[PDB]
Amino acid sequence: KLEFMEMEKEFEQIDKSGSWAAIYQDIRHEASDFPCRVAKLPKNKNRNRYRDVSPFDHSRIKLHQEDNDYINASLIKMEEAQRSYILTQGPLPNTCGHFWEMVWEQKSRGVVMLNRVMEKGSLKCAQYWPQKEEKEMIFEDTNLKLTLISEDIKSYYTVRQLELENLTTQETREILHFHYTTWPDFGVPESPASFLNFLFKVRESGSLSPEHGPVVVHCSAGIGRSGTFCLADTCLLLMDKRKDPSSVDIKKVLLEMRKFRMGLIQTADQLRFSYLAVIEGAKFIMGDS
Numbered sequence: 658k659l660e661f662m663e664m665e666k667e668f669e670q671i672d673k674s675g676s677w678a679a680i681y682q683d684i685r686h687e688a689s690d691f692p693c694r695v696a697k698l699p700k701n702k703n704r705n706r707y708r709d710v711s712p713f714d715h716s717r718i719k720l721h722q723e724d725n726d727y728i729n730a731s732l733i734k735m736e737e738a739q740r741s742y743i744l745t746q747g748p749l750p751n752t753c754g755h756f757w758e759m760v761w762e763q764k765s766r767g768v769v770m771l772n773r774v775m776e777k778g779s780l781k782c783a784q785y786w787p788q789k790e791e792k793e794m795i796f797e798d799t800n801l802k803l804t805l806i807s808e809d810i811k812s813y814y815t816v817r818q819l820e821l822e823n824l825t826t827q828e829t830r831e832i833l834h835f836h837y838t839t840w841p842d843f844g845v846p847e848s849p850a851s852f853l854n855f856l857f858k859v860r861e862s863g864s865l866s867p868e869h870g871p872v873v874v875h876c877s878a879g880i881g882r883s884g885t886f887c888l889a890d891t892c893l894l895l896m897d898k899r900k901d902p903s904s905v906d907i908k909k910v911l912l913e914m915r916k917f918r919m920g921l922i923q924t925a926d927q928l929r930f931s932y933l934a935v936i937e938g939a940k941f942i943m944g945d946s
C-alpha cells in the first residue's frame with residue numbers, strides 16, 4: 658500500500674511548518690526523571706566522561722565485581738519491539754577494562770561505535786581496541802585479552818573482527834565491531850542511505866539476535882548518536898511488526914526509550930533524521946526485491 662504517501666507528506670508538513678524544534682523540545686520536557694545516585698558517588702567520579710550525563714540507577718549495567726560494580730552504561734528494553742541494547746559512553750583510559758568486562762558478562766556479540774577517537778582536534782574517546790593484529794591488548798584489571806582478527810574498512814564505516822578472551826575462564830568469543838566513522842558530535846550521518854546501510858549490516862550479522870546478549874552501542878556521551886541509532890532500529894521493527902506502520906509514534910517511542918537513559922537524541926535535526934531514516938528504511942524493507 659502507498660500508505661507511506663501520508664507519512665511522507667506529514668513529514669513534509671512538519672518540514673514546511675518548521676516545527677521539528679518544538680516537537681523535540683516538547684519531548685525533552687516530558688521525559689522521565691530518575692535517580693543516578695550511584696553514578697554520583699565520589700568513588701565513581703573518574704568513571705564518568707561527563708559531569709552531567711549519568712545512567713539511571715534502575716537500569717544501569719552492573720559489573721560482576723565486589724570492588725566497584727559501576728560503569729556508565731544503560732540497559733534499554735523495548736517491550737513491543739522485542740529488542741534490547743546497552744548504551745554506554747566512549748570508554749575512558751581507565752575504563753576500557755570495565756568496558757570489555759561488561760561485554761563479556763552481558764554476553765554481547767557486537768559493539769556499535771558511532772563516534773571517532775579523535776573528534777574536533779580533541780580525542781573524545783580512548784582507543785579501547787587494537788589497531789594492529791600483532792599488538793593485541795591485555796587488560797590486567799579485568800583479566801581480559803583482546804585481539805584484532807580482521808577488518809573491512811569502507812568509506813562511511815568499518816567492520817572489525819575481534820577475539821575477546823577471558824583469561825580467568827580461558828574461554829574465547831568472537832566480537833563483531835561496527836564503527837560508523839562519519840557522524841560528528843551533535844550532528845547527523847552523511848545521509849540516510851549510508852546510515853541505513855550500516856544499520857542493515859549490523860542487523861544481518863546476527864549481533865542483535867535474542868540468542869546473544871544485547872548489542873553494546875556507544876558514541877561519546879552515549880546519548881545523542883547512540884539514541885538516534887537505537888530509535889531508528891526500534892521504530893523500523895515496529896513498522897514491520899504492526900498492521901498499520903503509520904501507527905508508529907516516534908515521539909512516543911523516544912519517550913519510552915528515555916525511561917532507560919537520559920537525553921536520548923541531542924538535537925532537533927537528529928530527531929528529524931531518525932524520522933527520515935525510519936520512513937526511507939521501511940519503504941525499502943517493505944518494498945519488492
Ligand SMILES: CO[C@@H](CC(C)C)c1ccc2cc(-c3ccc(C[C@@](Cc4ccc(C(F)(F)P(=O)(O)O)cc4)(c4ccccc4)n4nnc5ccccc54)cc3)cc(P(=O)(O)O)c2n1
Binds near residue numbers: 707709843877923
Ligand atoms: C533525566 O532527567 C533529567 C533531570 C534534571 C533536570 C533533574 C535530566 C538529568 C540530566 C540531564 C543532562 C543533560 C545533558 C547534559 C550535558 C550535555 C553536554 C556535555 C556532554 C555530552 C557530550 C557529547 C554528546 C553527544 F551528543 F555528542 P553524543 O552523540 O556523544 O551522545 C552528548 C552529551 C558536553 C557537550 C559538549 C562538549 C563536552 C561535553 N556535558 N556533560 N557535562 C557537562 C558539563 C559542562 C558543560 C557541558 C557538559 C548534554 C545533555 C540533558 C538532560 P535533558 O535533555 O532531559 O534536558 C538531562 N535531564
Ligand SMILES: [Mg+2]
Binds near residue numbers: 789790
Ligand atoms: Mg598489519
